[PDB]
Amino acid sequence: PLHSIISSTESVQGSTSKHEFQAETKKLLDIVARSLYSEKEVFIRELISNASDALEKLRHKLVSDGQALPEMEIHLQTNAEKGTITIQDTGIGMTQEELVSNQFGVGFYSAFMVADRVEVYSRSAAPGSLGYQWLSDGSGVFEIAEASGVRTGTKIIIHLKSDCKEFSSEARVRDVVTKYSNFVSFPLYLNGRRMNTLQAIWMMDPKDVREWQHEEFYRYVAQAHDKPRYTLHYKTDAPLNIRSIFYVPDMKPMFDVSVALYSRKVLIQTKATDILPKWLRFIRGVVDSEDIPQESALIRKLRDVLQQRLIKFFIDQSKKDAEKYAKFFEDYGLFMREGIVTATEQEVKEDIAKLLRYESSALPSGQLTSLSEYASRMRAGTRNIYYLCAPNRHLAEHSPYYEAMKKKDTEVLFCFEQFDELTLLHLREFDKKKLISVET
Ligand SMILES: COc1ccc2cn(C(=O)c3cc(C(=O)n4cc5cccc(F)c5c4)ccc3O)cc2c1
Ligand SMILES: COc1ccc2cn(C(=O)c3cc(C(=O)n4cc5cccc(F)c5c4)ccc3O)cc2c1
């Protein structure tokens, strides 16, 4: 059966009171009316986001009391024969003061992007609150009147413009909801039918997400069938709001030609390249930041924060399980080398270089060392990092130049990957120590 709450229960006994929009609001309404910039479908995800916020505010306050929880739901209704789309939620609602004084910005301008007029009913969840009707056609006036039959929460009826009638088709609205609003955290219904929505596990505290939940989400966001070999659930609130999960696949890398971008569980970009550095394009997963608006200073800042955190994560993994990290470096190490070569900043080159692992003349065959570990073994008076590129360890060890160096205890990195020469040429130095090939 169907489950709908939207219907014409409201009535207004008296006359409305007329108010004039304040000057800046009127100016923004003028921009909307004249704007041809028309990613028009966005109003739906903003209204759903505001409904979700209103529901959470109610739920938290009732839980802070001993109070039972009512039905907390978001409903959409389309009406083709009347050219409307309606959203209604059973959240905290608005007082008359807020309807006159006042998120209320974002829901407002995008509604008037698609509306000839907007008809709102709201009733605060506070006990003894009255219901109100708010009306505007986007001119400099709005109307408010006390209304009977308003359900606690907020209902917004958008009377669509003649060129926006597509949003009174159920199938069109269904697709918009699924595209941008699939992870809304309260039950969502369209025309009485429950929408298939998913759990935004990146918002949970990382200690609460189980491996089976990560495996299901990884397979979903990567459209994969393996499991992730690594999982980084990164939550921070400074300098930026970040709720993110990053996976690296169990399978090897073609992946050589990403990460979805959200803002409080609202999709911004399905496949947001530019959010990670190019060399991290093998990462799958999701990044959610409240701080999001396009080659902005903010995106650059988020990218640099995430790069540092992922490098730290991989360093941490090498300490937790060196054998698993060595396999990761074997499988994904060409991305690290690419990043060193293409990086502009020396500090970024050296940060990525902390992930490189090489054999060494000082270690058993097959055992790997990092550049930092090599540096900690350098003997006083010797101030450079020496390496030798060769096809295998036997050929490196029988270099006449290495053999001579053995006499004075100098460690030499043994590098067997064909792109090691270019990587270490471009790195040039590490921790103020020049990288020098022992053969020219
Ligand atoms: C904690 O944050 C809170 C705290 C309390 C909150 C109450 N809220 C609402 O009652 C509400 C507002 C919208 C909305 O987008 N608009 C846009 C309008 C334009 C003109 C006139 C209007 F009445 C409009 C409303 C949609 C659904 C909602 O439930 C949201 C909240 C969010
Ligand atoms: C172990 O410590 C040492 C100590 C000394 C070392 C010298 N080493 C050399 O490889 C070397 C270079 C040259 C030279 O003049 N070259 C090499 C060129 C290659 C390309 C283009 C050019 F123009 C070149 C000019 C001559 C003899 C050499 O043995 C490794 C060393 C290692």
DSSP notation for 22-66: PHHHHHHHHHHHH-----TTHHHHHHHHHHHHHHHHHHHHHHHTT
Contact 353, 427 (CB under 8 A): yes
The number of helix segments (H) and strand segments (E) in the chain equals: 13, 19
Contact 415, 388 (CB under 8 A): yes
Exposure of 181 by Cβ count < 10 A (0-12 exposed, 13-18 middle, 19+ buried)?
A: buried
Strand 153-160's sheet: what is its strand order?
17-20, 141-147, 131-136, 115-123, 153-160, 84-89, 74-79, 188-190, 193-194
- Only one residue has tokens 């060193």, namely 340
d(CA 187, CA 183): 10
- Only one residue has tokens 């090939």, namely 437
Maximal C-alpha separation, the chain? 101
Q: Which residues line ligand 1 (CB under 6 A)?
A: 47, 50-51, 53-54, 57, 89, 91-94, 99, 103-104, 107-108, 111, 118, 120, 122, 134, 153-154, 156
Contact 53, 266 (CB under 8 A): no
Judge whether 50 is annotated as a binding position.
yes
Q: Look at ligand 2, atom 3, and give the residue with the nearest C-alpha.
A: 438
89 forms beta bridges with 74, 154
Q: Residues near 271 by Cβ (< 8 Å), separated by ≥ 6?
A: 258, 260
**Ligand 1 center–CA 164 separation, angstroms:** 22
Answer yes or no: is the C-beta of 440 below 6 A from any ligand 2 atom: yes
Write out the two tokens for 40: 């028009």
Contact 147, 131 (CB under 8 A): yes
Alpha helices in 222-370 (DSSP H): 297-320, 322-342, 346-353
d(CA 330, CA 197): 38
How determined? X-ray
Residue of 263, 423, 273 whose CA lies nearest to 333? 423
Point out residues after which the chain has a gap (C–N over 2.5 Å).
102, 253, 257, 293
Answer yes or no: is the C-beta of 410 below 6 A from any ligand 2 atom: no
Residue of 313, 269, 311, 273 whose CA lies nearest to 288? 269
Resolution of the determined structure in angstroms stands at 1.6
Alpha helices in 35-188 (DSSP H): 42-64, 96-101, 106-114, 170-180
What fold characterizes domain 201-322? Ribosomal Protein S5; domain 2 (3.30.230)
Exposure of 344 by Cβ count < 10 A (0-12 exposed, 13-18 middle, 19+ buried)?
A: exposed
Q: Dihedral (C-alpha) 294, 297, 299, 301: value to the nearest 10 degrees?
A: 170
The letter for the amino acid at 88 is: Q
Q: Look at ligand 1, atom 18, and give the residue with the nearest C-alpha.
A: 108
Residue of 368, 336, 334 whose CA lies nearest to 355? 336
Answer yes or no: is the C-beta of 407 below 6 A from any ligand 2 atom: no
d(CA 325, CA 322): 5
Q: Look at ligand 2, atom 18, and give the residue with the nearest C-alpha.
A: 440
Please identify, by atom number, the ligand 2 atom nearest to the C-alpha of residue 438: 32
Using the 8-state DSSP alphabet, how is residue 165 labeled?
A: G
| CATH number listed for the domain at residues 11-194 | 3.30.565.10
d(CA 173, CA 402): 70
d(CA 215, CA 205): 17
Answer yes or no: is the C-beta of 336 below 6 A from any ligand 2 atom: no
Judge whether 409 is annotated as a binding position.
no
Write out the two tokens for 314: 């991989």
Backbone angles phi, psi at 260, to 5 degrees: -85, 150
The letter for the amino acid at 353 is: A
- Only one residue has tokens 């130049």, namely 401
d(CA 350, CA 347): 5
Answer yes or no: is the C-beta of 114 below 6 A from any ligand 2 atom: no
Q: Residues near 62 by Cβ (< 8 Å), separated by ≥ 6?
A: 68, 69, 70
